[model samples]
Target chain A: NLPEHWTDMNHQLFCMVQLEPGQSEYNTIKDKFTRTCSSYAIEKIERIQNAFLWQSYQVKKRQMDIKNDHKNNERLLFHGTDADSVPYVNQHGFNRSCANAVSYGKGTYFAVDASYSAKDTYSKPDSNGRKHMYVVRVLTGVFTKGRAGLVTPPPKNPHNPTDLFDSVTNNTRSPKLFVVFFDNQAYPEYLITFTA
Target chain B: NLPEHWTDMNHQLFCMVQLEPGQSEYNTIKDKFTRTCSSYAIEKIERIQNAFLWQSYQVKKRQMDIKNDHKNNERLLFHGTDADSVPYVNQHGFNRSCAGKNAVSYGKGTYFAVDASYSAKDTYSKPDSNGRKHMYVVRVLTGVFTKGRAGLVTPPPKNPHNPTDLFDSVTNNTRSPKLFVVFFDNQAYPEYLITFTA
Candidate 1:
């Protein structure tokens, strides 16, 4: 995937908090977000960097370059080449591929889900204090395709899968899962106290 | 690169080894190898599994697709759109564009340099013995482009100045100096610790 950052919304977007020395909400959000997303994103981002991992899953049932007829529903999914890999993440490049692959064909689409993690290293005293949370950072809107601009949804579809062009769909792919690691070297007591 | 494996001969070579208990030689090789290679690679068939972190102060230089010119000394230079931000890396996939940009317009001559790091947590002990050392893992040779090819310098430069179509030239747009990081999680210890130095 070339060109990770574009002038449009195809750049790094996160809902993070610059916490004080001790922010209660920070840990709460981080812990909650990580637990929710770890099952999917941990392997994709690697274990050590597991302190925080972003993952995307793609489901391409068919080829692109066609509008929905009576045959099937259009879909989009994002993940790296690895089965469990988070999409658009390389040791080196931007995630343009992950984003591009999901849209079936290339262009922009609505965001679906986004999550991030917060880990407490071997040093921290409180286990609950170091939490990884993944919440819906952005609620673009309802799922509809090509309506006023979105690639219009399929006709007579109760399944009603969101269209790729919708913001909600785009946002869903941004969730983060993490393993927070506090530095036990700096705070030996924290490491000794915590159960690895 | 289209293929996963990377070996920058001019900058670094990947290392691979095994460490047994009470192995001091293994440890020496691992330390020495890490100093040279940016990151060690773990390959399984067509897939690349793990990448370790150690690269610091590496700059993001652009690659050009040079046409092969056998007689010329292909001058390698930086060639990318965003030359100011020297592609700093922290977490793997921190920014998808960081690594993905290289793949863009990837001709045979186009290339990009990446900074990487990782941990040898698996082979080493939960608490490694004080006297023992570990083997440093690296790729002996990667299937990528480099300065030296076929006994010539810089990818068999085809033209006097052009290194595209096998004679393409890496464009020199803007060159910026990069800063290397010297941050230590442990501050009490001396900034630099000579491991097991007499």
Candidate 2:
């Protein structure tokens, strides 16, 4: 049975359940994390359970589902976090008041390559050289080439002009990174602590 | 009495309450509008009553009040809109995906001009079938802001001492900033809708 607090969709605290070595859920996420990084050692991977933030993410999902436009683009992405930022993300649920990176777009930045997020620029090491990364469920939907200052995606069709793109990326052909403008479009699903 | 639809905080339709010329609220807001836009002339001003968006804005305000950070920096800023984009903003509540005038200097974020003349520019406000243009008097959270660069995804840290302490918003310049840019949609709320000509 789930904890009583787990049902509170508005609760702010996220209770992490550590996955055992042989657990199916653990193996699945571990494979996804290490698929792009083999040389590094994983210290710990914990599943996040926060109903409040999940409610917000679900809103973004249903909002897109009505149009059936970007529904096929959801995936687990990685974001590098430092000591100070991790707490802030936990408190604010990735509040967009200030962004993580705007090099690709002026929104929350995520990468498919764990190694890319592991870079010092993103996953900066703390005093003991400990790095942290988040495996987040991001709704990339339909993406386009992201310019430096794009707060939102460009129009899908200039003539029709109603619908718009969901996210932005480096290369549309097969983007390894993504940036979304909406606050709830991405949910931090797992925290991966490790060393290079 | 408010409309039944007003009870829905998530409703998309905005029931605009037009302020009468002689009404107290109308005179106050109109005076502020004319204080700078003397050349732009008077126009029809409607008070936006989107409970959903107002709720979102209150959260941002409350968020700032808790920290005693940028609560004092909230201002009535201007954002121009085209015919096509007006409905989108009405439904989505300034989602912060589209920005003003492809600003290269202050980075990619939703921009709100400090002056009405700036929002009244042809590039910012495009006329529709009825030769009318729309602009919003948005409530913006202009936190402890700093200059923004072309490639900035987020605001730079407050200082070099700690890299994690970040500024809340971005501006064109530190001394006498021109534009205010915020990343989140809730950080800004379109409170008053103005319909006018060039």
Candidate 3:
């Protein structure tokens, strides 16, 4: 029978006896208790096993995706300045606000792409004016949890960069922000407006 | 020698000679017609042959360009839409007055993604609370033809079936009224919105 207090061998002894001794009133009680104890150990073991397997899988998967994504990301270019080198939003302009109305999780902030020299560096597609590059102010807000990342530049191309979008979809987890920046003349001649 | 009348041969022979064969001879009063007229069979033949060569070259050059441009047309896809039921202009609440003010060209037209659906279709990786499909809405004008596109959606992702913000980008060349209808809500919460309705 299981004692009120549970020690390490509490269930082991019970199971050890159950196997040798056939089913009996006493054995049945002990067997039940041993099974329950064993279940606890088994659950913990499975949890560890799953974690190990998941980690290994993620390591391999990330390597493959990075190899492919590196090529894909290179197909297009940002053609902008290194914001981090010259902060887009310094302490003077930006302070974290309340959690973003849309994301409902992280404090959002805004800043400008004040690096004029960087903004000036651009490429034109052809005489037809099909493509252009211009200056823009940058606004950033990051949630502090789960798949979240900083608005940092890529490794090789220090001036250009990318960011992750999906970190929360199903649950109410992170905060978001709404940012606006001034339009520069260098960018293509399209003007659009948005409101939330 | 001056004659009172000229044969067609005289004109042809004069052209081949490259000189006014009858510049002298007492001002050639006698049959001026005969002096000018002579056999032009050789000159006419040469002219016809040259014209034929010019025409043939033009035809061949055109044929080569058509064959080559077919491949280059893929680049054109960056500016226009394709057949798969994909409509070009997703939104057009532009400021024509700001056309030249902001840019040199004032890109005043609409463009669509060749594909009916935009970059992200079924579901985004793990989006924010809005969890909607993020798309690029580039505004192209005369001066600044295209603008930033990623992560701009109208309705949040909570409403999937008709998720909003599905446009890849918008570039217009004509200032005409354009219409854009999209399944605004994400698949989880089917929602839709007409872009130019307002």
Most lDDT-accurate candidate: 2
Query: Which residue pairs collide in model 2, if any?
Result: A101-B153, A102-B153, A149-B108, A152-B97
Every candidate's lDDT: 0.22, 0.73, 0.21
Model 3: residues >4 Å from true position, as ranges? A1-150, A154-196, B1-165, B173-198
lDDT (10s digit) by residue, model 3, range B51-164:
111222233233223433432111111111211111111111111111111122122322223231321223211133433222222212111112422222221222245332
lDDT of 1 at B168: 23
Q: Model 3 chain A: which ten-residue window has the lowest total lDDT?
A: A40-49
Considering only chain B, report the TM-score of each candidate against the true chain B. 0.20, 0.84, 0.14
Displacement of residue A66 (Cα, Å) in model 3 is: 5.8
Report the alpha-carbon TM-score of model 3 versus the true structure.
0.15
Over the stretch B47-121, how does candidate 1's per-residue lDDT look in tens digits? 112122221100011111111223232221111122121111111112212222122222222232211121122
Docking class for candidate 2: incorrect
User: Per-residue lDDT of B143-184 in model 2, one digit per residue for the tens?
Assistant: 788888777656677887766456778988789886887766
Alpha carbon deviation, residue A5, candidate 2 (Å): 7.2
TM-score (chain B) for model 3? 0.14
- Write the residue-wise lDDT of candidate 3 on A1-196 in tens digits: 2223222454221111112234343354333323322221111000011121122223323332443443221110112222221121111111121111222323222212212111222222234322222122232212123223322111223342222222122122522222211111011111111010
Question: Taking the tens digit of each residue's C-alpha lDDT, what string does model 2 give over A48-167?
Answer: 786545655665666565555445868889999787777666544675545445778677889889989999888899898889898998888878899887757777898745467888
